[PDB]
Amino acid sequence: EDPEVLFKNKGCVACHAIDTKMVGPAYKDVAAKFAGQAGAEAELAQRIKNGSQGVWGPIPMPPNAVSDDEAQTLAKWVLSQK
Numbered sequence: 397e398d399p400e401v402l403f404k405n406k407g408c409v410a411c412h413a414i415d416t417k418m419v420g421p422a423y424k425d426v427a428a429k430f431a432g433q434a435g436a437e438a439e440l441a442q443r444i445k446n447g448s449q450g451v452w453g454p455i456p457m458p459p460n461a462v463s464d465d466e467a468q469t470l471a472k473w474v475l476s477q478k
């Protein structure tokens with residue numbers, strides 16, 4: 397599926413933007429941190445699906461209603477925002 401349509405449909409848009417921080421980090425900042433680190437895509441994909449806490453602040457990203465292939469698509473698109 398298309399990452400931009402997922403970004404809207406799966407509700408990511410409620411907590412994230414690409415250039416500014418809302419509830420969670422901006423995607424440009426995430427892409428900048430995970431730069432070109434080996435294995436980042438798989439690691440972000442897991443956090444998108446199962447939830448995250450502590451990396452960008454004290455408040456959690458709740459687990460998302462995405463499938464594994466959807467999470468990978470989204471992770472890859474977030475990383476391309478750098």
Ligand code: HEM
Pocket residue numbers: 403406407408409410411412419420421426439440443444448449450451452453454455456457458460462470471474
């Ligand atoms: C929609 C499915 C969605 C995506 C995609 C997404 C991605 C995402 C990334 C890539 C991170 C960074 C994870 C890390 O660096 O390893 C991240 C972080 C947070 N998110 Fe998110 N996110 C999506 C959806 C949502 C929703 C709906 C919310 C708001 C309820 C939310 C919130 C957060 C928060 C907060 C973080 C920071 C977690 C941290 O460790 O500090 N996200 N998200």
